[PDB]
Design a protein around this ligand. Sequence first.
Ligand SMILES: CC1CCN(c2ccc(CO)cc2NC(=O)c2ccc(C#N)o2)CC1
Length: 289
Amino acid sequence: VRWKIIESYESYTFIEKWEFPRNNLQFGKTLGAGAFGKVVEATAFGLGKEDAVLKVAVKMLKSTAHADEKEALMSELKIMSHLGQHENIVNLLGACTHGGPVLVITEYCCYGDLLNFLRRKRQLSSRDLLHFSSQVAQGMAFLASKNCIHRDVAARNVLLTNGHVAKIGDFGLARDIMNDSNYIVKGARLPVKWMAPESIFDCVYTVQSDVWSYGILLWEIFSLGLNPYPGILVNSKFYKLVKDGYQMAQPAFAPKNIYSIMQACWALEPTHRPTFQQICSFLQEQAQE
Ligand SMILES: CC1CCN(c2ccc(CO)cc2NC(=O)c2ccc(C#N)o2)CC1
């Protein structure tokens, strides 16, 4: 769904410098769009203290959006302005909230999404896959430290920028959810194959829930982009399987130790799942290549 700050975990949750001239923005092609929003590539002139002309990403609402939509965009803006910067996050760089529609300026990731990258690379080395894994875990450990839940951890939501470095961000407003069959209609469109059981059955969303999803992301990375639960449709049988403890088989390119992380992330009991900080350390130790 969308990023959100929750109460207590790990740390402690206690709670217009970003304004940029929209005329100093030169819009380019649209990168993606959803039911009520879209993100476009653009060039910003004189942005930041370095007065760069760098290429950036600009998120904005569509004509079909109303108050509720506008608030969600402002809320994301507010969350990003509060989180602070991190190397593996699609960082906020500015915003245009006056003199026209609200625009949120973030870093642009030239290589696009990790899922498509893996599919066109089926060269990639085992070391590269481990790096992708570590960078996302670093970003997730960062969010966890700010009591921020992601709720849509998946390879399609990991972007690659200069140096093929992975970054995560809230792409919900530009995600084409209505036409993506991976988002299952539920009353709501949810990425069921990536969701933890408690999120599916109890509608509970916590950092541990994102850990489960991170395990599914690992399976996507080490299978070089296969759709999770291959050939299995989302329905009663699927839900019964996951609830009953079913887990996907080890991916073709995952070393046993990496598969062990997936299994840990998929522990049915949320408190039996590792933390993102523990995952980072294990990956740091390499565990396996
Ligand atoms: C939901 C999808 C997220 C990724 N997507 C991009 C596709 C291709 C490229 C490379 O040309 C870049 C993409 N996106 C970004 O660099 C970026 C920064 C912030 C956002 C947001 N939302 O998307 C299209 C929409």
